[PDB]
Amino acid sequence: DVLMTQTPLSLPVGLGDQASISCRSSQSIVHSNGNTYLEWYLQKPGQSPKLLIYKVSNRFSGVPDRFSGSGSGTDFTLKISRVEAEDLGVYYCFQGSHAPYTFGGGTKLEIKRADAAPTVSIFPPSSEQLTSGGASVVCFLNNFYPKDINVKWKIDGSERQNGVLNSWTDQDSKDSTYSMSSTLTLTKDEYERHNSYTCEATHKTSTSPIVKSFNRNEC
Amino acid sequence: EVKLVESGGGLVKPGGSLKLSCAASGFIFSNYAMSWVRQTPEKRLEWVATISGGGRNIYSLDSVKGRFTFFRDNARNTLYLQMSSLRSEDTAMYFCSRENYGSSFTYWGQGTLVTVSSAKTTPPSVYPLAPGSAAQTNSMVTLGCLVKGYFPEPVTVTWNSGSLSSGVHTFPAVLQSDLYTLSSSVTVPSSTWPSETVTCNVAHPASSTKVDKKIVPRDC
Amino acid sequence: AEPWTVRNEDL
């Protein structure tokens, strides 16, 4: 089978600048009819893939000429100019010349913007959850850039690693930020054997942690 | 314009079967070939099959030959994928898609999700997240809901039934121990809560579950 | 065998 490989895995670029993405085929992809059905797809977050480019370098109607593709033999390249935030998402190459037809693994395009510290909020378990024997502590870290951030939990001032489940959004194209969610899940009885619950976020924007906590002996 | 709408996705057990459909509109259906393409939860795209305008000529991935079958009913503008002998790895979002001159996958539908596993259908528990009663407020206030212990995906979260679209972050589910957990946050101006109601609406089709949890300030 | 109806025709 043909194997299709993309590089890089992801690529940050600023507004106004040009991105350039490679796609290489493990073997040549000239269809028996002499055409080359190398195509480029964009999948924006939360949406279906849309077509940009077919037969190496033809722009599907509706697609601006900021986008153009090229290459030959085993080596293809898609070039985006004057990059806007709305262009973020995963870009996929696909050969449709030899069955079985194969896609590359995707290149995620990230849009650069200025650093931004996360907005951090902490939520104790709801009364309703406690009633059923659960006690999840929830910590939202919203609207930050860049992607890399680190959340550590503390119970009564000791670090805590077990029962923590993190989740991140893709990049929001409205402001070019990320957000994440961190959930510490314990039983009611373990929650009630301790007082102080803290989530600390460490992010490039600050030498020291942003810290949110509360004591149960105050609610 | 050209519209494609898949349907039939859902939870099925290893070894079982499931038929999917793709309703087509805005073009003369029999004049174009159609494809099924699937996407794994970790986002890898894979062509499954292509079937000609009149249905006679099909190609497919060898790993789905015999288990999956492909056919179409042109007079009803509908394309099918009859699945059998499903395995974990068949788990994916399934997209149909129409050809065009020079392009393989010119128009796509929204997709329908097929989950292959034997963990059982569990409805969500939906918990409202108000800030702690000793916490400080706060000119733009952040409120949450936690949707825990459900299976399979998807769930739809909204706030005031969509009327608060503005300051929303809804995080992708995380699977653990055969149950998914998820949360959504919404940020509104201090003048609008608690004086007016904020509520999240959580739908879980698979269990025909629809829950509204009103976010109430805590007691001290 | 070729399952495309329009794709392989050049405009």
Residue B169: its chain A contacts at CB < 8 A? 140, 142, 169, 179, 181
B8 and B77 both lie in a single domain = yes
Residue A214: its chain B contacts at CB < 8 A? 132, 134-135
For A197, the closest chain B residue by CA position comes to B132
Per DSSP, the three-state class of A53 is strand
Per DSSP, the three-state class of A179 is strand
B13 and B85 both lie in a single domain = yes
B50 and C3 within 8 Å at the Cβ level: the answer is: yes
B104 and A128 within 8 Å at the Cβ level: the answer is: no
Residue C7: its chain B contacts at CB < 8 A? 33, 99-104
B171 and B109 both lie in a single domain = no
B98 and B38 both lie in a single domain = yes
Burial of C11 (0-12, 13-18, 19+ CB in 10 A): exposed
What range defines the domain where residue B139 resides?
Answer: 119-216
Distances (CA, A) of B209 to A49, B94, B150, B214: 29, 23, 11, 16
Chains A, C: CB contacts within 8 A come to 6
User: How many whole angstroms separate alpha carbon B203 and alpha carbon B210?
Assistant: 4
Give B1→chain C minimum CA distance, Å: 19
User: How many whole angstroms separate alpha carbon B180 and alpha carbon B176?
Assistant: 6
B112 and B156 both lie in a single domain = no
Give A35→chain C minimum CA distance, Å: 9
For A132, the closest chain B residue by CA position comes to B125
CATH code, domain carrying B212: 2.60.40.10
Residue B102: its chain C contacts at CB < 8 A? 7, 10-11
Per DSSP, the three-state class of A86 is helix
Domain count, chain B: 2
User: How many whole angstroms separate alpha carbon A219 and alpha carbon A41?
Assistant: 51
> B188-194, long-range: CB within 8 Å, 24+ apart, which pairs?
B188/B140, B188/B141, B188/B143, B188/B164, B189/B139, B189/B140, B189/B141, B190/B137, B190/B138, B190/B139, B190/B140, B190/B141, B193/B141, B193/B143
Token pair in block for residue B160 = 């005031």
B131 and B98 both lie in a single domain = no
In degrees and rounded to multiples of 5, residue A166 shows phi and psi of -90, 155
Residue type, B66: G
Give A81→chain B minimum CA distance, Å: 23
Experimentally determined by: X-ray
B185 and B91 both lie in a single domain = no
Of B33, B51, B54, the CB nearest to C7: B33
Domains and CATH numbers, chain A: 1-113 (2.60.40.10), 115-214 (2.60.40.10)
Of A92, A127, A140, the CB nearest to B144: A140
In angstroms, the first-to-last Cα distance of chain C is 22
Contacts with B211 (C-beta within 8 Å, 6 or more apart), sequence order? B124, B126, B201, B202
Q: Please give the helix or strand (H or E) that residue A59 lies within, else none.
A: strand A58-59
A167 and B174 within 8 Å at the Cβ level: the answer is: yes
B135 and B191 both lie in a single domain = yes
B13 and B107 both lie in a single domain = yes
Task: Give the experimental resolution in Å.
Answer: 2.3
B26 and B74 both lie in a single domain = yes
Final residue in a domain of this structure, among B118, B153, B179 = B118
Give C4→chain A minimum CA distance, Å: 11
**Where do the DSSP E strands lie in A67-204?**
67-72, 75-80, 89-95, 102-103, 107-111, 119-123, 134-144, 150-155, 158-160, 164-168, 178-187, 196-202
Contacts with B27 (C-beta within 8 Å, 6 or more apart), sequence order? B2, B98
C2 has binding-site annotation: yes
For C7, the closest chain B residue by CA position comes to B101
User: How many whole angstroms separate alpha carbon B153 and alpha carbon A101?
Assistant: 28
Final residue in a domain of this structure, among B57, B85, B118 = B118
B101 and B49 both lie in a single domain = yes
What is the SS3 string spanning chain B?
A: CCEEEEECCCEECCCCCEEEEEEEECCCHHHCCEEEEEECCCCCEEEEEEECCCCCCEEECHHHECCEEEEEEHHHCEEEEEECCCCHHHCEEEEEEEEECCEEEEEECCCEEEEECCCCCECCEEEEECCCCCCCCCCEEEEEEEEEEEECCCCEEEEHHHCCCCCEEECCCEEECCEEEEEEEEEEECCCCCCCCCEEEEEEHHHCEEEEEECCCCCC
Q: Which chains touch C (3 or more CB pairs under 8 A)?
A: A, B
Q: Which chains touch B (3 or more CB pairs under 8 A)?
A: A, C
For A106, the closest chain B residue by CA position comes to B44
Q: Measured in whole angstroms, how far is the alpha carbon of residue B119 from the centre of its chain? A: 18
B30 and B101 both lie in a single domain = yes
Token pair in block for residue A76 = 């293809």
Name the C residues in 1-11 with CB < 8 Å from any A CB: 7-8, 10
For A35, the closest chain C residue by CA position comes to C8
User: How many whole angstroms separate alpha carbon A176 and alpha carbon B172?
Assistant: 18
A219 and chain B in contact, CB less than 8 A: yes
Give A88→chain C minimum CA distance, Å: 29
A128 and B46 within 8 Å at the Cβ level: the answer is: no
B96 closest CA partner among B40, B172, B165, B20: B20
Strands B58-60 and B45-51: antiparallel
Angle, vertex CA B163, rays to CA A142 and CA B166, nearest 5: 30
Final residue in a domain of this structure, among B76, B100, B118 = B118
